[PDB]
């Protein structure tokens, strides 16, 4: 579908190290929040799309 990653992918993602790179603890703490956002968004969309399906089933019937 239109989403590239899952939370799982954020968790598993590895980066090589370079001589003067990003602070790893800062990147990883940041990504931990990204993980939470992917978890939240995925849960929100599942619930919203099911609600929609259920409301349409209700509306389009006697």
């Amino acid at each position: 579908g239109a989403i590239i990653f899952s939370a799982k992918d954020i968790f598993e993602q590895e980066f090589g190290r370079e001589v003067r790179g990003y602070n790893k603890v800062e990147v990883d703490e940041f990504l931990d929040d990204v993980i939470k956002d992917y978890e939240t968004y995925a849960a929100l969309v599942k619930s919203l799309r099911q609600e929609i399906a259920d409301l349409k089933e209700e509306l389009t019937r006697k």
Partner: peptide
């Protein structure tokens, strides 16, 4: 274990 954090992936040793 029930909430994924990337620090759970730091080397044990």
């Amino acid at each position: 274990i029930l909430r994924r954090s990337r620090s759970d992936r730091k080397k044990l040793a």
